Amino acid sequence: PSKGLSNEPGQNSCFLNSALQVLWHLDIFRRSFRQLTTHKCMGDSCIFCALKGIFNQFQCSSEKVLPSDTLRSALAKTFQDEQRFQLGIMDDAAECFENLLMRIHFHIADETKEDICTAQHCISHQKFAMTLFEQCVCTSCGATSDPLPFIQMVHYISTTSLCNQAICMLPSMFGELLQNASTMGDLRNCPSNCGERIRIRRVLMNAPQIITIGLVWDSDHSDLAEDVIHSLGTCLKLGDLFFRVTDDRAKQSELYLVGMICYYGKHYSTFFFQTKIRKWMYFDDAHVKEIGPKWKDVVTKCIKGHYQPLLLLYADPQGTPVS
Amino acid sequence: SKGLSNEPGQNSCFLNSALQVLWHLDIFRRSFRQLTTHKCMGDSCIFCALKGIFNQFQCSSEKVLPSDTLRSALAKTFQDEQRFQLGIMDDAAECFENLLMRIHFHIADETKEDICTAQHCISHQKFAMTLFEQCVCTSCGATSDPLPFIQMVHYISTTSLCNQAICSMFGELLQNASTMGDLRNCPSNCGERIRIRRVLMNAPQIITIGLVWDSDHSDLAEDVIHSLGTCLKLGDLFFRVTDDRAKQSELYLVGMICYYGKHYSTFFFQTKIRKWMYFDDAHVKEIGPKWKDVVTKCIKGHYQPLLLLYADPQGTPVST
Amino acid sequence: MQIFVKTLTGKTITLEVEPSDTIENVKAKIQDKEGIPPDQQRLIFAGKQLEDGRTLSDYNIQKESTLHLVLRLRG
Amino acid sequence: MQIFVKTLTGKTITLEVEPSDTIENVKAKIQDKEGIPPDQQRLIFAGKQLEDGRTLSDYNIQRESTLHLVLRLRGG
Amino acid sequence: MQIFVKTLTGKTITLEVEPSDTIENVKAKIQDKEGIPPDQQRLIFAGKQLEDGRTLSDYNIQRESTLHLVLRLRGG
Amino acid sequence: MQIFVKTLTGKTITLEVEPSDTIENVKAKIQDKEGIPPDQQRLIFAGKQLEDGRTLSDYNIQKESTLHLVLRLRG
Ligand SMILES: [Cl-]
Ligand SMILES: [Cl-]
Ligand code: NA
Ligand SMILES: [Zn+2]
Ligand SMILES: [Zn+2]
Ligand SMILES: [Zn+2]
Ligand SMILES: [Zn+2]
Ligand SMILES: [Zn+2]
Ligand SMILES: [Zn+2]
């Protein structure tokens, strides 16, 4: 259901309301979260509990607008020492989105000796997280660097790298375009200094069903927005997104753009394609609007408003909720 | 002093030259006497042939002694590789080296890891050099994978011994000579070039040096004998020496095998007479007390020393 | 000690740094080279965001390590 | 226990191991099947590098689990 | 048994070990006293390079044995 | 794959070899560079002398390994 989130003068909650809309409208997340009964509760201040109360309202309430203040407060108390997501202070929607996924893992999984999440109920690691390792490899002399493995919830790519690689290419290529843009500046010397140069290689070993792309902007009033919006594709081939994709489920995976958090003028909003109405919705806190059934309708609005897309959410339509 | 026989076609002065050295080194002889156990090969047994020759060296009263018992055990043991065959002419340093190997094969319990720990093994306890090679770049820190091994003789080029001489403490001369053509790129190719380093890890009481020759008719012969030193400080033979005993170890030139026109001889210092001796198969002769005479005998016959043997004066044989 | 920073434009720059350097120290070096103010700087290493008050040694930032710079957009 | 080791060429090394086997133990089995020196071997599972001194059950590595073998080569 | 690890600088390390201790554990103990990563360590005994998978007993390394520590590292 | 050989002059030459090459092959290639017949060639690697018939891989001779050439003096 498409409802709005209230934002009063001074509480600066548009960064949270933008992320909340993505999480509620993402099918793999919402259906998964509903089947979740037990959680590591933090007490009167607890993100999971505040999130559940918001999600229950999104379905049972008849109000056209709902308050996110419970999650806003719980987020503030949880990050008091870090001085992030504090009450009355603006913040970043992608940082908010990342940390909500991270705290969902803390609420769902259990502390493992080696910090390895295998819980089949953890939405973040089972569906969102990308498991990668980076390595320098020289084809001429055969030298290789030490592999550096890590997990990320968002894949960040530079907007200028994206725009430049689009001009060079001038659908079904957006994955390759994203990969060439991400690797553009990753030139390094051979690990053994044969004299040749190498490109950092990223290898994905898992198979996320939701890829969250983060756009690295050059400015808060970017003059590259229009070129960025026109460079965005609606279909992502996961097998092309990284230099190597070793998991068979991910080689075959095709993910479609269903959501996009947008920044403009120190404010945040969210576009999302509701699969039911078969149309693109727009959520700016309390304001919910029908944009249209065509991606071009979203392009026209983003370009007219000088919107800067920050988070792109590609969901596998053949994806499944957590078991 | 005794001598060894070579029939006209025997061509056995390679063995005889090496047999004299082993009998005269006090460390090898006194060790070998306390040995009454060995992996006998039966007929092709080098130990028993060797034993038989050492019994006659001590008890027999003849001036010249036969070595055909070792020549057949050597030929039968190496019949699969066609080396030291009956009648053929062969290398003396090769013979001296394989004899030390064959001894160990007879005094060891065949450790699976191939290490040798036998307290009675003369070849490893007294003669062997356990070292490793490694490329170390002092500018960027990089370091090649260390290559360890055991060698029985340290081989040094003649063209390098002489050249370094042109350029008291001849241990540095041997070290400086042995590392002449050992320039390598840095293991991480930082741009620097380094020299291969070798560091000795045990304390051999007999250091045997091999001289790599350019031809059977070398014109460096005279200069090689002129660069040889009698006293060898083990602490300077290698880039580094880990064992303290070796660090303060000084070794004296005690014996040497010489080549000349498809023939072999042996010079040795009989300490019981304080005079250097000479053994050309069956012909024995006294040289004198001064090492200068060994030089004059050598440069007058165009001799080419193949093996030089240095012994720790304060050495000891194997222990129970 | 030499570390790399992937900047907002995709270019890779070189930071001369010490293991005992706080990341606020690193953010100041990035400001001089790249012009981005510190509060707008997001440093990611091995998928995790570096948080002020810590040093490079805390995160095992070693030589030739790469920091991924993301611009923070407060809203 | 049967565990699988994925090389970056796509070859799969099947290994018979125990949960109490260390990572150096696993790298020795890989050398027995491939001749790859353990010092070149890096093993990765679930986004974490596996430490030589720790065991397979430390990382909760179970039956039919897939480990990723990445090699460190000097080259030349 | 107290084994002796000798380094190129001249420092003679002493460690309390048992024959079961694999070479990797000897390297770990070395890291506990010098701070040298085992990946950079190479042990040598009687001219043979010891492997991290094998154990001291496999090399007949008896008590009071002296081992040689050589470091294989890269530059810069 | 290249290989280092320390000749009788104390200098080092470079030989292009493969690990499946017998040492009679290595000896023949040494002959084309240094002019010493293989029967006078003693090849030492890491203390042991290479016994004719084996291959370079049987002695674990990788790239950039250094062989010590030694003149055999039959007498
Ligand atoms: Cl604010
Ligand atoms: Cl690809
Ligand atoms: Na190891
Ligand atoms: Zn709760
Ligand atoms: Zn998780
Ligand atoms: Zn290279
Ligand atoms: Zn016998
Ligand atoms: Zn022995
Ligand atoms: Zn270097």
Residue numbers in the entry:
A (entry chain A): 29 to 198, 206 to 358
B (entry chain D): 30 to 196, 207 to 359
C (entry chain B), F (entry chain E): 1 to 75
D (entry chain C), E (entry chain F): 1 to 76
Quote the study on this structure.
Following construct optimization, we obtained crystals for the most stable complex, USP54 conjugated to diubiquitin–PA, allowing the determination of a structure to 2.5-Å resolution by X-ray crystallography. Its asymmetric unit contained four copies of USP54 conjugated to diubiquitin–PA, of which two copies formed an identical arrangement. Excellent electron density covering the entire complex revealed that the two ubiquitin moieties of the probe engaged two different USP54 copies with symmetrical binding in trans configuration. To assess the solution state of this complex, size-exclusion chromatography with multiangle light scattering (SEC–MALS) measurements were performed, proving that all USP54 samples are monomeric in solution. These results allowed the assignment of the dimeric arrangement of USP54 conjugated to diubiquitin–PA as a crystal artifact, likely derived from stabilization of the finger domain of USP54. We propose that, in solution, the complex of USP54 conjugated to diubiquitin–PA exists as a monomer and that USP54 engages K63-linked ubiquitin chains through its S1 and the S2 sites in cis configuration. USP54 adopts the USP DUB catalytic domain fold consisting of hand, thumb and finger subdomains. A canonical catalytic triad was positioned in an active conformation, with the warhead of the diubiquitin–PA probe covalently linked to the catalytic cysteine. Moreover, the structure revealed three coordinated zinc ions, which comprised two positions within the thumb subdomain in addition to the common position at the tip of the fingers. In USP54, the S1 ubiquitin displayed a ~30° rotation in comparison to the common binding mode and differed in all three main interaction sites. The structure of USP54 conjugated to diubiquitin–PA uncovered an S2 ubiquitin-binding site within its USP domain, consistent with biochemical assay data. This interface is centered on the backside of the fingers subdomain and is governed by hydrophobic interactions with the I44 patch of ubiquitin.
Ubiquitin-specific proteases (USPs) represent the largest class of human deubiquitinases (DUBs) and comprise its phylogenetically most distant members USP53 and USP54, which are annotated as catalytically inactive pseudoenzymes. Here, we report the discovery that USP53 and USP54 are active DUBs with high specificity for K63-linked polyubiquitin. Assays with substrate-bound polyubiquitin reveal that USP54 cleaves within K63-linked chains, whereas USP53 can en bloc deubiquitinate substrate proteins in a K63-linkage-dependent manner. Biochemical and structural analyses uncover underlying K63-specific S2 ubiquitin-binding sites within their catalytic domains.
